[model samples]
Target: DFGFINYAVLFGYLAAMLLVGVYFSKRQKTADDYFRGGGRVPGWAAGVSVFATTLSSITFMSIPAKAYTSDWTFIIGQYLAIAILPLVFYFYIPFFRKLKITSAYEYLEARFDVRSRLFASLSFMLFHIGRVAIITYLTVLALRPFMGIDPVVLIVLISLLCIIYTWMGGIEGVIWTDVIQGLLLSGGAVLIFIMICFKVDGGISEIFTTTAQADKFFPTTQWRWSWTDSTIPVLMIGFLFANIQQFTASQDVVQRYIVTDSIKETKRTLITNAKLVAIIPIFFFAIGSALFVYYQQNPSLLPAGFNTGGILPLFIVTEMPIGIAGLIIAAIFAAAQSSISSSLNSISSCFNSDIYTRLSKSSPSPEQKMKVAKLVIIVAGIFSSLAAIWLVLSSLIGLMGGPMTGLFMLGIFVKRANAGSAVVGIIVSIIAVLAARYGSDLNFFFYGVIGSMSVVIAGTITAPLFAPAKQL
Candidate 1:
């Protein structure tokens, strides 16, 4: 159970976020301002907003967890994503921002047709709803072991808090909250580092030697062309394309790009985000390495079947002093809140413009649109709150997984990728990813690459049929 100090700290952070949300609630006069922050946010702030938006609690905990178990090979994707910055800034940014649409997926309708727009938008909605659920579930898993609170109760509270703020603040609230959370995330990591430093027996140098000797600091896998293993090449090459498409195609990041003042600002925002990402992972990875030394000195504390991901929480609960520990735990909540708020806003934006407005016969008044937007935000937030439970319900009932991108790639880069062929391309691409997954035991890394290629190839073949038709 949280002591008075921990509760105070956590409550303080939550209260601040709530106030920020409510404070901005009055500013939104139109759906565009609600979704895009009036398109006047500073580039630096927007960059940090993107960083925090992407930095879910998953990254907060999982990077350290993975570094504890395996080598740094998986981080190759992070490094490789740097290469795609030019492509995103030059091509994707101008293409989407010029159109000035609320949802990034709106470019789909302009590029192809309403059917294509609906398909992509709905895909994003279902995907993010589940994504937020998993993030919330992970946050609960990390906290429940120590909190003594009911997991369902925590889920309800967390969902309501994130959703209510997001509903009130809109994109501006999301961005300002993100700036605060991003700073605290770094602060939290630093505190963890300080605690680990004091705990390690032979000091910082010893951690390097111990982890290196154990072969945990670097990739042990050879540079061979293996499809199943997470080889450096697979991560560097395969995950690069996957990560690139993930950023450019996703509404969360693209919305940030859209919110910035100009293409120049967008470029600066993205580059700044990339730079920050490079630096932040080092802090978590170093914590993992130092942790290897600390655990080695005092072995077997973590019993068998205890998930490695729980190590950070375990440390905070067991070792750290109280007041600081509470702050650290609050940081985790901050990370979770930052991500949840961003998702709520992004999903609400996508729904209001792409699905709700488009399907309606007439344009609603600005006040009417705001009302509808807030309504969808509430509905989406409530649905997301139950997302963790839906996992059980999904198993009992029936649900699904996976993602897509080649269709978007076709719509943007390939001029001939007309609506009919674009749909065919998406279906074919998904089918190809499935075949690649089950047929030959290909590594998950290559799934995105294969899926994208299949779409490009399929769309190319079918484009002749729609050549006489005007491209959307």
Candidate 2:
């Protein structure tokens, strides 16, 4: 046994994930069962669901790469989200719950019209195209050059596998699978940390001292409240973005919030998710920083200009001992697969209930909806898988920046982000974000957000307080 544990671990994940789908398929009846899991999932289960869906390869691969290259600035976004959670707990979640929504975009429509709802939904769909399908494909790309098989075939295989399970079990399947995957990925990282410690022989403190002097870790993160600091300021803004808008706006996430059994559970799950969000940044980044330190110490271990992204896979294979390798590799694959499954499930739900069901010229019977939902899953899987490939090819070093934060934030944070005005506001915000990203890295675009939110808030106040709309 040449100690190929990562592959064995990956095989185990594929098996367990499919089993999770099968378990839920046994009880699935209504489209609701498939779509929202009959809204009966436990609070803890919902918490795990939130964790897996949001914690994608972006967290796994990007954090280490960024920590290695840019110190801790990129890692600041997640920490900011952690701080933003308390605000979401109080303000955004309460109103979101009050809406009794099936889609987060439903709120946008209510505040405006068919036009607004459709736009927000479309925007979300776009975001997922990038996050799930496109990013997932890139994941394939990362492996394919090493594996030597045609990546297109691998992309199709992965997409089909994700759809087969996600469509069969729906949210129930995705949630439980993510729980396992999340655990494995987290464990794999921890195992690497311990290996590095033993390798260094002097333990963590000694390792940090070496890292600090090598200009290898935490190089420039002088913690302070200055607006002028290029790196920290963007992350601080991202935190506010998470709290006020992003948390509430994302259907990929908030959908899990409503799937729970009660407001009590909803509240419990939200707080717990916030905590998970906090711990995850620490979990991924601390390990990532450590890996950066190790790489600095052992230059011979990797190739020249050794794409920092290679660190995770390289560390696991080269560093881990034989017996436990499979366990953690299963976890890394779990991390990747769990995310793919959850994304397929989330996209399927949004397409099924929000667009397909709501837009049918005539309302669908329960059976009709279920069939369409399944068909949609097939399409979404292909689309997202292709998307993953595109992201991998186009911008391997990309970051989640600008236009995305601004447009979605409008829907969630601004009370008047109603249908009529949101069109111009969103359009304005996008152009502002682009200009900010390309023209200046100074983050002046957030000021655009402040102004847009202020206008919408004022509009909400000035509009005649709610009266029954002229009955359709």
Candidate 3:
């Protein structure tokens, strides 16, 4: 049962988060301060912010869930993320910093045309809107059992709080709070792992032995080539493209690059983020394995018919001592709120820079621009909250991961890829991914590969038909 102490801790954490927003609110003096932190944010703080966003609430819970239900094949994706760091550092970082554009899709416009920019930015906005809703819904769903609050109420409260902070703080607020949240997230997981180690029979060694014996480590069967499963090779290749797309094309991430003072700071941000990305998953996956062993030894403690998705939370509330559990729960909230705020800020930036400013005949003043950006944040927040409510009642849920990445690649690498060819590539890539998704038994991991290749092949072939346009 959640006691008074737990509530105190939870509410205290929430108050601190809101205070962070209040602290930063006074610092904002212009749209640049709101959007890019006036290009003064330290590299390490921005990197941790990026890490927090990447490690969303869903990822916080689901990674452990994955380990509880299956093996460690998913860990390969994290490795692939690290593997792609060089490419991000060498190419994407310098490109974005040199361009000094607000939106990542701005490059698409410069390379192709306004049409391409609109498509990519619109795609980003649409995708993240859904992302915001889904994250809100899932966070509420995950905490509903533990909190005894109505899911609808939780959704509204969480959404409103996130919106208020994001509206007040802008990018600077988002990054600093993310630094705190990232620490809490990782710290909470580490605490749980330690507690589980003490509770288990043989501690860490036994965990290793039991999980290894149960094939929870690297299962030999998962090592072989397969197109239908998340095999090592499949995860490796799929996540390579997926991470590339995120670093290179996603506005939320690319925004981090430009927020720093210089190219050197941006490089440090990537390095800091890369280190966290590589290390954090180890703790979550280890907790999953530890939970498996801990529960197996204490079978009666395991809840009957427990959803794997809620396994981590279930463990936290039921097993841990009172105040500690609440702290961890706050950590989960930290994960969710960090991602939501990042999405809200990034989405607002995209609309303000890519859509509003580009189309408006007259340049809006700084005050007017700030007003519009905050308005976008408010509107997007409310819409996502309502969407989350709908999702809770209906439980209905392509992701443009493949095609967006493919379109980006077509524009960047292919000299011949004009607006016309880029459009065709996007269309063909989407169709190919849809066909692959529905018609074939191919592993979902290959969707990125298939979609990207479709664009490159189709775009390259069709490039001759469309006359090359002048470069930006």
Winning model by TM-score: 3
TM-score of model 1 vs. true structure:
0.94
Candidate 1 weakest lDDT stretch, 10 residues: 395-404
**Model 2 lDDT on a 0 to 1 scale:** 0.63
Compose the digit string of candidate 2's lDDT tens values, residues 350-424: 777669877888999988878877777778777777666665557111112222334345555554444445555
Q: Between candidates 1 and 3, name the one with more favorable lDDT.
A: 3
Top of the candidates by lDDT: 3
TM-score of every model versus the real structure: 0.94, 0.85, 0.96
The runs of at least 3 residues in candidate 2 whose Cα sits more than 4 Å from the true structure, single-residue gaps closed, are 1-6, 73-75, 141-158, 214-230, 242-245, 389-418, 438-472
Model 1, CA-based lDDT: 0.79
**Please, what is the whole-model Cα lDDT of each candidate in the order they appear?**
0.79, 0.63, 0.85
lDDT of 1 by residue, 108-137 (tens): 778777876787778777777877888888
Better TM-score candidate (1, 3): 3
lDDT of 3 by residue, 1-472 (tens): 5788988997898888789999999978777888888898999999999889878887888888899889778888787777777787786666677777888888877777787788778888888888899888889888999889888988866778989988988899999889999999999889989999999999999999999999998888887789898888888888888787777778888899899998788878988998988888899999999999988999888779878888788888888898998899889888898999999999999999998889899998988888988899999998998999999988001346666777777776777778888888878887888888888999887887887788878888898889875464
Cα miss at 28, model 2 (Å)? 2.4
Q: RMSD, model 1, all Cα superposed?
A: 2.5
Lowest lDDT 10-residue stretch of candidate 2: 395-404
Clashing pairs in 1: none
